[PDB]
Amino acid sequence: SSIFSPRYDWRTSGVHDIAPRDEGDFLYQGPQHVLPGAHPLPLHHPHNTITRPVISPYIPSPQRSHPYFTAPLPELPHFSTTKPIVYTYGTMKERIIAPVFNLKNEVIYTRELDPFIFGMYPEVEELSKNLTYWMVRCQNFASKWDYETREIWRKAKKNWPNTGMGMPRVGNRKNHLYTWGGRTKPSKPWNMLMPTMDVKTWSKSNRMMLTLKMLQGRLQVVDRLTLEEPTQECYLELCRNMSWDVRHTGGGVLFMDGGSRITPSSEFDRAFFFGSFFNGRNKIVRPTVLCDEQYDYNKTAAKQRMKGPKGAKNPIPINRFNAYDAMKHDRLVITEGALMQLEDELYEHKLQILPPHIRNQLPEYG
Amino acid sequence: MPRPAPRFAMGHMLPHRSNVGSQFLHTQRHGSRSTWYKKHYFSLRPFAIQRHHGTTPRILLDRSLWKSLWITKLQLPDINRWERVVNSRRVTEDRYAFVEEEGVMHKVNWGL
């Protein structure tokens, strides 16, 4: 119950057995006793580098702006971004360099990241917009049906006169007062609403979520996502070699397959796409953070036989990257082709975001 | 953000039809109650029985409810066995009972 309530502390005994079980219970030794789970901060998900291991050069520290390299390593080949780097109002204003992993769980080289993509510092309001939209959209709207008073199949005639017998005054008695009747304003799939998401807010929240994953250190860049055979055992062997906990209980994996660095593609790899179907915590998404402009061709209820919620008639597809899936899946694996596609789709956006006195210097700088 | 998505329509609240409410607020059906185990106002919550609501469960135990009612033979194949989720699996142990012995709680075989 509420803490400001009499019923909050009315259980005085019977909650705890005075005898402790001889298997797990222990006594408090003192201040030097390291208690499992105890932490000063309120952590509703108290994980560490063993339960939820981070994949990054450094463990995310307050003395570091991000848990990745800030300068290219002299022993690893460095690959710059496919598009030039520009720092807008929200970027981290610092160089971000991440190692590219080989499918043999090895670091082949390193690659510069774009601050506009993985440097857009996260904001809780934007991430909340993203998550709320995703949940309200992913709800099932066909099951929102309910009966109305005019859908009860009773005689359209007053059952008894109002003044005759001791019964109360009623007519058709098919309303909500009776256990068999329906409501005047019932739930209907077409009366429900589907929210609209603008491309600006969607892209901003997705880039904030990517930046949040990078800051937490759970972003991993691989060169390819390919399997020798399209079977599930090959996918599970790849996951076991790459230390991907795709179990229903482990830290899930979110793949963004965009192809290789030399061979990028907007379609998923066929072998990996056929192998990735496993009953666990793994999800593959399209290599894009943008979305199509949503429309509504029934904004005034002109087509009455419409079956479907009010609002956008072009919602975001399921296989798109989103805050809900990013939060549910611990690690985020992204390919170099997906990186290239994100950069190519966000270049003109950040250029139009740029201010005019800086925009006039773009052809000057190249 | 043009009219951000409503928080009440986020699918985390299926409440009883109240006096106040938006046109886009999906309340509970007529004649149906909001909480499943609250047959009466004094009905207790089942200890280990879990009714999966909303999405499809990732791991469905044999004694948990999902689109089904409680049937003894279906939810308890062996009453002396206790099923649980160990390492994203269905692991079954011998059901036990706690008894006071020498000032501590000791585990004895529940069936015996």
Binding site: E148, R150, I152, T179 | -
Partner: peptide
Amino acid sequence: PKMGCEEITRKARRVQLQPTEY
């Protein structure tokens, strides 16, 4: 209503999406 009520076992008029105003 009830789950197996005679009121809902038989079919009746089905309400449609209402038209909006000008």
